[PDB]
Design a protein around this nucleic acid. Structure first.
Length: 117
RNA sequence: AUUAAGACAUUCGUGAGUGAUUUAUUUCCAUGAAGUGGCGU
């Protein structure tokens, strides 16, 4: 109550955590909360999935492997981890995260250090 | 040799004295130095 710095820090850290959960999920320290925008677009009218998944697939199909010993999330389910699409036509991708703000640059860390997409 | 002759409308005289191109009039009104993170699933 008598120290404003801790109050400010906690408030702003909570704001960042909540907004990260809403928009792009939370993966820093061993915790993973799926981005709620992705889940909402998955569960609604004919499904729209991450544009980030499409860019990750495209950068996979050419070469250098992205860091992270996992796979893109293909939907909402327990450990619904996959790298590919079903036999019918591919998913209906879209710029899901543009509605909450244009980002103008996406950073991807591939398997070896010191180079980034 | 004739009711004739003689005679500068001339002298003097500064177009001058006093007089702010001045009184009044907003280079103003409008507008976010601001938008955005991402991978490490």
């Amino acid at each position: 109550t008598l120290d404003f710095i801790y109050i400010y820090n906690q408030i702003f850290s909570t704001i960042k955590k909540d907004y990260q959960i809403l928009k792009s999920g939370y993966n820093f320290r061993n915790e993973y909360i799926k981005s709620l925008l992705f889940c909402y677009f998955v569960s609604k009218y004919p499904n729209y999935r991450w544009e980030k998944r499409k860019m990750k697939q495209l950068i996979k199909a050419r070469g250098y492997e992205l860091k992270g010993d996992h796979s893109p999330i293909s939907g909402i389910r327990e450990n619904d981890n996959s790298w590919n699409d079903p036999n019918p036509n591919g998913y209906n991708y879209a710029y899901i995260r543009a509605i909450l703000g244009l980002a103008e640059q996406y950073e991807f860390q591939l398997e070896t250090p010191y180079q980034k997409a």
